[PDB]
Amino acid sequence: GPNYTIADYIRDNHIQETPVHHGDPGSPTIDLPVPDDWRLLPESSRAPYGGIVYTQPADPNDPPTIVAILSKLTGDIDPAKVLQFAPGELKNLPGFQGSGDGSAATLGGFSAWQLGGSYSKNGKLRTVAQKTVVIPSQGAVFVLQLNADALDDETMTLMDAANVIDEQTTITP
């Protein structure tokens, strides 16, 4: 894609990135709320740091989901640059249609960025949203991404939960 992404920033600055899993020593404790009619997702390929899934999907093989990804960055890291380039990933999605590059946000005292829009996948319109939180810690910068994704016709269901996830998720270093 044409837009500069967090992945590009990590590459172009020789920053080491490693995945983080629940219980890793020295990692922050991050708990997502589980709204009514949603259920916890365990850690998996599709949900690296777990997430939540909607239990009454229109398509049981394609339910609304909000997944967490937690990475650990070490090296010469500017946390503000992670947030500056957070919009690139979504803006590079096939057929992405947005309402700007998002806006600044916070979570647990840590700076963040959130944006959303629609995109096309396999001839189906989807709603997507992403909140990125930078979590500077002992000798590293952790990056949390909360990725919401659902079919267009389930936008309201998705974003009602995403608003709760984006606001009530707790971060304890």
PDB file of C-alpha atoms in Angstrom:
ATOM      1  CA  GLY A   1       0.000   0.000   0.000  1.00  0.00           C
ATOM      2  CA  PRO A   2       1.026   3.628  -0.535  1.00  0.00           C
ATOM      3  CA  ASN A   3       0.590   4.908   3.028  1.00  0.00           C
ATOM      4  CA  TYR A   4       3.421   4.702   5.547  1.00  0.00           C
ATOM      5  CA  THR A   5       2.589   2.220   8.315  1.00  0.00           C
ATOM      6  CA  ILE A   6       3.829   1.303  11.775  1.00  0.00           C
ATOM      7  CA  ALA A   7       5.398  -1.732  10.101  1.00  0.00           C
ATOM      8  CA  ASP A   8       7.342   0.606   7.804  1.00  0.00           C
ATOM      9  CA  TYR A   9       8.450   2.715  10.775  1.00  0.00           C
ATOM     10  CA  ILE A  10       9.721  -0.370  12.615  1.00  0.00           C
ATOM     11  CA  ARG A  11      11.556  -1.551   9.493  1.00  0.00           C
ATOM     12  CA  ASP A  12      13.111   1.797   8.543  1.00  0.00           C
ATOM     13  CA  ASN A  13      14.469   2.363  12.082  1.00  0.00           C
ATOM     14  CA  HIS A  14      15.802  -1.143  12.874  1.00  0.00           C
ATOM     15  CA  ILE A  15      13.410  -1.562  15.794  1.00  0.00           C
ATOM     16  CA  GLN A  16      13.088  -5.098  17.155  1.00  0.00           C
ATOM     17  CA  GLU A  17       9.479  -6.273  17.477  1.00  0.00           C
ATOM     18  CA  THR A  18       8.416  -9.359  19.416  1.00  0.00           C
ATOM     19  CA  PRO A  19       4.913 -10.711  20.081  1.00  0.00           C
ATOM     20  CA  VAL A  20       3.579 -10.541  23.634  1.00  0.00           C
ATOM     21  CA  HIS A  21       1.345 -13.187  25.212  1.00  0.00           C
ATOM     22  CA  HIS A  22      -0.747 -13.202  28.377  1.00  0.00           C
ATOM     23  CA  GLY A  23       1.467 -13.708  31.411  1.00  0.00           C
ATOM     24  CA  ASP A  24       4.789 -12.861  29.766  1.00  0.00           C
ATOM     25  CA  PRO A  25       7.142 -11.551  32.486  1.00  0.00           C
ATOM     26  CA  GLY A  26       7.521  -7.785  32.435  1.00  0.00           C
ATOM     27  CA  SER A  27       4.556  -7.314  30.094  1.00  0.00           C
ATOM     28  CA  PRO A  28       1.611  -5.040  30.935  1.00  0.00           C
ATOM     29  CA  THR A  29      -1.622  -6.590  32.159  1.00  0.00           C
ATOM     30  CA  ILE A  30      -4.415  -5.749  29.710  1.00  0.00           C
ATOM     31  CA  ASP A  31      -8.016  -6.846  30.318  1.00  0.00           C
ATOM     32  CA  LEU A  32     -10.755  -6.335  27.734  1.00  0.00           C
ATOM     33  CA  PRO A  33     -14.384  -5.982  28.868  1.00  0.00           C
ATOM     34  CA  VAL A  34     -16.910  -8.486  27.550  1.00  0.00           C
ATOM     35  CA  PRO A  35     -20.203  -6.778  26.644  1.00  0.00           C
ATOM     36  CA  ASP A  36     -23.496  -8.635  26.741  1.00  0.00           C
ATOM     37  CA  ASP A  37     -23.982 -11.045  23.812  1.00  0.00           C
ATOM     38  CA  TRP A  38     -20.196 -11.160  23.288  1.00  0.00           C
ATOM     39  CA  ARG A  39     -17.812 -13.882  24.458  1.00  0.00           C
ATOM     40  CA  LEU A  40     -14.083 -14.062  25.156  1.00  0.00           C
ATOM     41  CA  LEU A  41     -11.764 -15.194  22.365  1.00  0.00           C
ATOM     42  CA  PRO A  42      -8.637 -17.092  23.476  1.00  0.00           C
ATOM     43  CA  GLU A  43      -5.251 -16.323  21.974  1.00  0.00           C
ATOM     44  CA  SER A  44      -5.018 -17.645  18.424  1.00  0.00           C
ATOM     45  CA  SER A  45      -3.598 -16.906  14.985  1.00  0.00           C
ATOM     46  CA  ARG A  46      -6.549 -14.634  14.208  1.00  0.00           C
ATOM     47  CA  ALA A  47      -6.611 -13.141  17.741  1.00  0.00           C
ATOM     48  CA  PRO A  48      -2.943 -12.973  18.802  1.00  0.00           C
ATOM     49  CA  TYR A  49      -3.709 -11.438  22.222  1.00  0.00           C
ATOM     50  CA  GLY A  50      -7.264 -12.747  22.384  1.00  0.00           C
ATOM     51  CA  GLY A  51     -10.343 -10.631  21.878  1.00  0.00           C
ATOM     52  CA  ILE A  52     -14.125 -10.873  21.897  1.00  0.00           C
ATOM     53  CA  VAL A  53     -16.628 -12.314  19.427  1.00  0.00           C
ATOM     54  CA  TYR A  54     -20.336 -11.654  18.957  1.00  0.00           C
ATOM     55  CA  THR A  55     -22.427 -14.715  19.821  1.00  0.00           C
ATOM     56  CA  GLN A  56     -25.411 -14.059  17.493  1.00  0.00           C
ATOM     57  CA  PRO A  57     -23.717 -13.534  14.116  1.00  0.00           C
ATOM     58  CA  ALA A  58     -25.610 -13.352  10.848  1.00  0.00           C
ATOM     59  CA  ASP A  59     -22.885 -15.585   9.366  1.00  0.00           C
ATOM     60  CA  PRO A  60     -21.464 -18.067  11.920  1.00  0.00           C
ATOM     61  CA  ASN A  61     -18.327 -18.403   9.775  1.00  0.00           C
ATOM     62  CA  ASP A  62     -17.839 -14.608   9.718  1.00  0.00           C
ATOM     63  CA  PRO A  63     -18.957 -13.139  13.063  1.00  0.00           C
ATOM     64  CA  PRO A  64     -18.225  -9.622  14.321  1.00  0.00           C
ATOM     65  CA  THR A  65     -14.948  -9.650  16.237  1.00  0.00           C
ATOM     66  CA  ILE A  66     -12.667  -7.287  18.125  1.00  0.00           C
ATOM     67  CA  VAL A  67      -9.181  -8.763  18.504  1.00  0.00           C
ATOM     68  CA  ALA A  68      -6.202  -7.491  20.469  1.00  0.00           C
ATOM     69  CA  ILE A  69      -2.592  -7.546  19.283  1.00  0.00           C
ATOM     70  CA  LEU A  70       0.220  -6.743  21.720  1.00  0.00           C
ATOM     71  CA  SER A  71       3.818  -6.278  20.586  1.00  0.00           C
ATOM     72  CA  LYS A  72       7.033  -5.346  22.383  1.00  0.00           C
ATOM     73  CA  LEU A  73       9.352  -2.862  20.671  1.00  0.00           C
ATOM     74  CA  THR A  74      12.985  -2.405  21.695  1.00  0.00           C
ATOM     75  CA  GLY A  75      15.510  -0.023  20.177  1.00  0.00           C
ATOM     76  CA  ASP A  76      15.432   3.665  19.224  1.00  0.00           C
ATOM     77  CA  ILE A  77      11.669   4.144  19.510  1.00  0.00           C
ATOM     78  CA  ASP A  78       9.713   7.392  19.434  1.00  0.00           C
ATOM     79  CA  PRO A  79       6.254   6.536  20.835  1.00  0.00           C
ATOM     80  CA  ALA A  80       4.727   9.535  19.046  1.00  0.00           C
ATOM     81  CA  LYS A  81       5.876   8.158  15.685  1.00  0.00           C
ATOM     82  CA  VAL A  82       3.996   4.897  16.295  1.00  0.00           C
ATOM     83  CA  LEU A  83       0.805   6.924  16.672  1.00  0.00           C
ATOM     84  CA  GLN A  84       1.667   9.231  13.765  1.00  0.00           C
ATOM     85  CA  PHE A  85       1.778   6.235  11.403  1.00  0.00           C
ATOM     86  CA  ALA A  86      -1.052   4.226  12.985  1.00  0.00           C
ATOM     87  CA  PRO A  87      -3.565   5.280  10.263  1.00  0.00           C
ATOM     88  CA  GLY A  88      -1.509   3.818   7.413  1.00  0.00           C
ATOM     89  CA  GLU A  89      -2.570   0.194   7.849  1.00  0.00           C
ATOM     90  CA  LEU A  90      -6.318   0.805   7.536  1.00  0.00           C
ATOM     91  CA  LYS A  91      -5.829   3.380   4.776  1.00  0.00           C
ATOM     92  CA  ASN A  92      -4.012   0.684   2.766  1.00  0.00           C
ATOM     93  CA  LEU A  93      -6.890  -1.809   2.955  1.00  0.00           C
ATOM     94  CA  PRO A  94      -8.493  -2.668  -0.414  1.00  0.00           C
ATOM     95  CA  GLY A  95     -11.187  -0.137  -1.205  1.00  0.00           C
ATOM     96  CA  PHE A  96     -10.842   1.641   2.134  1.00  0.00           C
ATOM     97  CA  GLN A  97     -13.299   4.514   2.563  1.00  0.00           C
ATOM     98  CA  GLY A  98     -12.867   6.681   5.641  1.00  0.00           C
ATOM     99  CA  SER A  99     -13.771  10.046   7.167  1.00  0.00           C
ATOM    100  CA  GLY A 100     -10.247  11.350   7.694  1.00  0.00           C
ATOM    101  CA  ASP A 101      -7.203   9.912   9.427  1.00  0.00           C
ATOM    102  CA  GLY A 102      -8.907   9.526  12.813  1.00  0.00           C
ATOM    103  CA  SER A 103      -8.209  11.375  16.030  1.00  0.00           C
ATOM    104  CA  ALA A 104      -6.066  11.286  19.139  1.00  0.00           C
ATOM    105  CA  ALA A 105      -7.280   9.244  22.098  1.00  0.00           C
ATOM    106  CA  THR A 106      -6.124   7.793  25.414  1.00  0.00           C
ATOM    107  CA  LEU A 107      -6.372   4.534  27.333  1.00  0.00           C
ATOM    108  CA  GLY A 108      -5.257   4.027  30.930  1.00  0.00           C
ATOM    109  CA  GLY A 109      -3.173   7.202  30.860  1.00  0.00           C
ATOM    110  CA  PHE A 110      -1.333   6.162  27.683  1.00  0.00           C
ATOM    111  CA  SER A 111      -1.589   8.077  24.420  1.00  0.00           C
ATOM    112  CA  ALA A 112      -3.543   6.496  21.584  1.00  0.00           C
ATOM    113  CA  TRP A 113      -5.016   6.987  18.118  1.00  0.00           C
ATOM    114  CA  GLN A 114      -8.323   5.711  16.697  1.00  0.00           C
ATOM    115  CA  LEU A 115      -9.800   5.646  13.190  1.00  0.00           C
ATOM    116  CA  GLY A 116     -12.380   3.644  11.281  1.00  0.00           C
ATOM    117  CA  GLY A 117     -14.093   3.190   7.962  1.00  0.00           C
ATOM    118  CA  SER A 118     -15.250   0.605   5.443  1.00  0.00           C
ATOM    119  CA  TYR A 119     -13.380  -1.654   3.039  1.00  0.00           C
ATOM    120  CA  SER A 120     -14.041  -4.491   0.604  1.00  0.00           C
ATOM    121  CA  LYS A 121     -13.016  -8.135   0.960  1.00  0.00           C
ATOM    122  CA  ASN A 122     -14.218 -10.998  -1.252  1.00  0.00           C
ATOM    123  CA  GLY A 123     -16.915  -8.775  -2.724  1.00  0.00           C
ATOM    124  CA  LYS A 124     -18.359  -7.926   0.705  1.00  0.00           C
ATOM    125  CA  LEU A 125     -18.371  -4.519   2.386  1.00  0.00           C
ATOM    126  CA  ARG A 126     -16.918  -4.537   5.900  1.00  0.00           C
ATOM    127  CA  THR A 127     -16.683  -2.024   8.723  1.00  0.00           C
ATOM    128  CA  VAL A 128     -13.286  -1.739  10.395  1.00  0.00           C
ATOM    129  CA  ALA A 129     -11.892   0.302  13.268  1.00  0.00           C
ATOM    130  CA  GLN A 130      -8.544   0.321  15.028  1.00  0.00           C
ATOM    131  CA  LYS A 131      -7.348   1.898  18.259  1.00  0.00           C
ATOM    132  CA  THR A 132      -3.570   1.945  18.750  1.00  0.00           C
ATOM    133  CA  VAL A 133      -2.094   2.543  22.218  1.00  0.00           C
ATOM    134  CA  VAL A 134       1.607   3.081  22.950  1.00  0.00           C
ATOM    135  CA  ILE A 135       2.712   1.810  26.358  1.00  0.00           C
ATOM    136  CA  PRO A 136       6.255   2.919  27.286  1.00  0.00           C
ATOM    137  CA  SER A 137       7.705   0.611  29.918  1.00  0.00           C
ATOM    138  CA  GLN A 138      11.017  -0.573  31.357  1.00  0.00           C
ATOM    139  CA  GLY A 139      13.447  -0.492  28.447  1.00  0.00           C
ATOM    140  CA  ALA A 140      10.765  -1.128  25.830  1.00  0.00           C
ATOM    141  CA  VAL A 141       7.640   0.312  24.236  1.00  0.00           C
ATOM    142  CA  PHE A 142       4.619  -1.974  24.070  1.00  0.00           C
ATOM    143  CA  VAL A 143       2.066  -1.400  21.307  1.00  0.00           C
ATOM    144  CA  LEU A 144      -1.552  -2.487  21.745  1.00  0.00           C
ATOM    145  CA  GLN A 145      -3.859  -2.559  18.727  1.00  0.00           C
ATOM    146  CA  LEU A 146      -7.593  -3.176  19.117  1.00  0.00           C
ATOM    147  CA  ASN A 147      -8.954  -4.246  15.726  1.00  0.00           C
ATOM    148  CA  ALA A 148     -12.713  -4.249  15.123  1.00  0.00           C
ATOM    149  CA  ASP A 149     -14.018  -5.956  11.989  1.00  0.00           C
ATOM    150  CA  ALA A 150     -17.486  -7.002  10.842  1.00  0.00           C
ATOM    151  CA  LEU A 151     -19.771  -7.188   7.836  1.00  0.00           C
ATOM    152  CA  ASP A 152     -21.405  -3.881   6.917  1.00  0.00           C
ATOM    153  CA  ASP A 153     -24.863  -5.017   8.034  1.00  0.00           C
ATOM    154  CA  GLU A 154     -23.506  -5.592  11.569  1.00  0.00           C
ATOM    155  CA  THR A 155     -21.859  -2.170  11.902  1.00  0.00           C
ATOM    156  CA  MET A 156     -24.008  -1.065  14.846  1.00  0.00           C
ATOM    157  CA  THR A 157     -23.375  -4.295  16.758  1.00  0.00           C
ATOM    158  CA  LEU A 158     -19.641  -3.972  16.107  1.00  0.00           C
ATOM    159  CA  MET A 159     -19.255  -0.314  17.043  1.00  0.00           C
ATOM    160  CA  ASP A 160     -21.403  -0.494  20.183  1.00  0.00           C
ATOM    161  CA  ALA A 161     -18.872  -3.015  21.500  1.00  0.00           C
ATOM    162  CA  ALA A 162     -15.848  -1.236  20.029  1.00  0.00           C
ATOM    163  CA  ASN A 163     -16.816   1.934  21.900  1.00  0.00           C
ATOM    164  CA  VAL A 164     -16.854  -0.054  25.150  1.00  0.00           C
ATOM    165  CA  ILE A 165     -13.596  -1.864  24.352  1.00  0.00           C
ATOM    166  CA  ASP A 166     -11.885   1.398  23.387  1.00  0.00           C
ATOM    167  CA  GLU A 167     -12.988   3.073  26.642  1.00  0.00           C
ATOM    168  CA  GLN A 168     -13.052   0.426  29.397  1.00  0.00           C
ATOM    169  CA  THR A 169     -10.063  -1.767  28.506  1.00  0.00           C
ATOM    170  CA  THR A 170      -7.628  -1.537  31.426  1.00  0.00           C
ATOM    171  CA  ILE A 171      -3.832  -1.324  31.172  1.00  0.00           C
ATOM    172  CA  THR A 172      -1.659  -2.092  34.210  1.00  0.00           C
ATOM    173  CA  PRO A 173       2.113  -1.910  33.463  1.00  0.00           C
TER     174      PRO A 173
END
